[PDB]
């Protein structure tokens, strides 16, 4: 890749507040904030949208 840390979705997720992101298994993200708890703010690569995601639904792309 280009050097930025990326995470991948392990499962589909449907958003539960206006500030959450919906995503498919296999989606890639840049993580923007992982400091305020277990909901992380992320940017989706295929959509470009930003929002919270549940951190248990993602894993680093490296492996």
């Amino acid at each position: 890749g280009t050097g930025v840390t990326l995470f991948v979705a392990l499962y589909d997720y449907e958003a539960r507040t206006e500030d959450d992101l919906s995503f498919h298994k296999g989606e890639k993200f840049q993580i923007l904030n992982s400091s305020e708890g277990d909901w992380w703010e992320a940017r989706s690569l295929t959509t470009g949208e930003t929002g919270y995601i549940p951190s248990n639904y993602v894993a680093p792309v490296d492996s």
């Binding site: 499962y11 589909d12 248990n56």
Partner: peptide, 8 residues
């Protein structure tokens, strides 16, 4: 609230 569990 914590993250929800992975889907069924």
């Amino acid at each position: 609230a914590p993250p929800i569990p992975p889907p069924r």
